[PDB]
Design an enzyme around this catalytic site. Structure first.
Site, PDB file in Angstrom:
ATOM      1  N   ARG A  26       0.818  -1.210   0.000  1.00 41.23           N
ATOM      2  CA  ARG A  26       0.000   0.000   0.000  1.00 41.23           C
ATOM      3  C   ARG A  26       0.868   1.284   0.000  1.00 41.23           C
ATOM      4  NH1 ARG A  26      -2.044  -3.598   3.649  1.00 41.23           N
ATOM      5  NH2 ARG A  26      -4.191  -4.426   3.471  1.00 41.23           N
ATOM      6  N   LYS A  47      -1.177  -2.241   7.345  1.00 33.75           N
ATOM      7  CA  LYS A  47      -2.555  -1.994   7.749  1.00 33.75           C
ATOM      8  C   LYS A  47      -3.035  -3.113   8.666  1.00 33.75           C
ATOM      9  CE  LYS A  47      -7.248  -1.311   6.066  1.00 33.75           C
ATOM     10  NZ  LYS A  47      -8.039  -1.685   4.864  1.00 33.75           N
ATOM     11  N   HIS A  90      -4.698 -10.925   3.951  1.00 34.68           N
ATOM     12  CA  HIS A  90      -6.104 -10.679   4.222  1.00 34.68           C
ATOM     13  C   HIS A  90      -6.634 -11.765   5.161  1.00 34.68           C
ATOM     14  CE1 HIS A  90      -6.494  -8.162   0.308  1.00 34.68           C
ATOM     15  NE2 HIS A  90      -6.485  -7.366   1.357  1.00 34.68           N
ATOM     16  N   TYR A 146     -10.968 -10.206  -4.047  1.00 34.39           N
ATOM     17  CA  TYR A 146     -10.351 -10.351  -5.382  1.00 34.39           C
ATOM     18  C   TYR A 146     -11.371 -10.593  -6.463  1.00 34.39           C
ATOM     19  CZ  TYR A 146      -7.346 -11.803  -1.643  1.00 34.39           C
ATOM     20  OH  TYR A 146      -6.719 -11.891  -0.442  1.00 34.39           O
TER      21      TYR A 146
END
Length: 312
Positions: free
Chosen positions: A130, A167, A265, A274
């Site tokens: 990210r 994250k 994830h 996805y």
DNA sequence: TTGTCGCCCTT
DNA sequence: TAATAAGGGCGACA
């Protein structure tokens, strides 16, 4: 799209609830079809019909941390997910130009902005990390690409290991081998004597935005592409290598799980994270899995891209 | 003028 | 699960 103020099921034009709207206000229809989550405070609800709400922003409120949280209609969400598939194709179509920019620039001076931009893009093509806004490093101690520091980079004989907590407090670990074009550039960019200094010390949010603009995309679009590429590569590997070929959804579920594991994830979020909806349309005809089994990944990728383009 | 904020939108 | 968290993009701001 006027924001009306919500208090115990009723709507007002003002934040102090002095001006009640008519019980016939079109926005009451919206409240028939949505539930306002009770953890939110200072809720606003946009003055519009349900049919309109479906396509855009519906309501907004504050969570316990004081962040304004924004809630969208299901057609908005549907649209957003369509755009993601199109973004996949857009990045697919511009990767040659990005690699031309990278491969030219990684021959340059270590403290050159374009050099750092080239390494930044190259790290993105490899690891899909990210953006890394400063805001979230300050707020949450979150690290992403822009907020990487030399401490996160370990050099060893024939590899470089990148390790950070990104994250959602998820740890990430990436490896660059000596044969890779990223190896020498990263070796020379990192400053082992300045562990608390940022790796991209000549970059800035402004510089990154101005640079990515030349490719007609955002940085996050690179992640969208890399993550879905990894998705499709897993799907392809699976159809090619699994001994007794599994049922359609066992195949997708397995492919979501393998991707989720590497991207980081949770097993819950990974479910819809996805391009599984694309694979769903494609398996709708009998020849598909046969075709995929007989393809190289590059031709599989082109088949998937062609499907998206011609979908809508 | 340029790093940071806050609104909107996304993951 | 049940309850609901935290990223990015970009105009706005001094």
């Amino acid at each position: 799209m006027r924001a009306l103020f919500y208090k115990d099921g009723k709507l007002f034009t003002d934040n102090n609830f002095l001006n009640p709207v008519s019980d016939n206000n079109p926005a009451y229809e919206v409240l028939q079809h949505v539930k306002i989550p009770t953890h939110l405070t200072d809720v606003v609800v946009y003055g519009q019909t349900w049919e309109e709400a479906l396509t855009r922003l519906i309501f907004v409120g504050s969570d316990s941390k004081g962040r304004r949280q924004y809630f969208y209609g299901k057609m908005h969400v549907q649209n957003r997910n369509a755009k993601r598939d199109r973004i996949f194709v857009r990045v697919y179509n511009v990767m040659k130009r990005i690699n031309s920019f990278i491969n030219k620039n990684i021959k340059k001076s270590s403290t050159d902005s374009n050099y750092q931009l080239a390494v930044f893009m190259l790290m993105e093509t490899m690891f899909f990390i990210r953006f890394g806004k400063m805001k979230y490093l300050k707020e949450n101690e979150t690290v992403g690409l822009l907020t990487l520091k030399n401490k996160h980079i370990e050099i060893s004989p024939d590899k470089i290991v990148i390790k950070f907590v990104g994250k959602d407090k998820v740890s990430h670990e990436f490896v660059v081998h000596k044969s890779n074009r990223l190896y020498k550039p990263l070796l020379k960019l990192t400053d082992d004597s300045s562990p608390e200094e940022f790796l991209f010390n000549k970059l800035s949010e402004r510089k990154v935005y101005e640079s990515i603009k030349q490719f007609g995309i955002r940085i996050k679009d690179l992640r969208t592409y890399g993550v879905n590429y990894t998705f499709l590569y897993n799907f392809w590997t699976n159809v090619k290598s699994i001994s007794p070929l599994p049922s359609p959804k066992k195949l997708i579920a397995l492919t979501i799980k393998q991707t989720a594991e590497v991207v980081g994830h949770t097993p819950s979020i990974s479910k819809r994270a996805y391009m599984a909806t694309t694979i769903l349309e494609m398996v709708k005809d009998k020849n598909f899995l046969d075709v995929v089994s007989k393809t190289t990944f590059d031709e599989f990728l082109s088949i998937v891209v062609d499907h998206v383009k011609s979908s809508t």
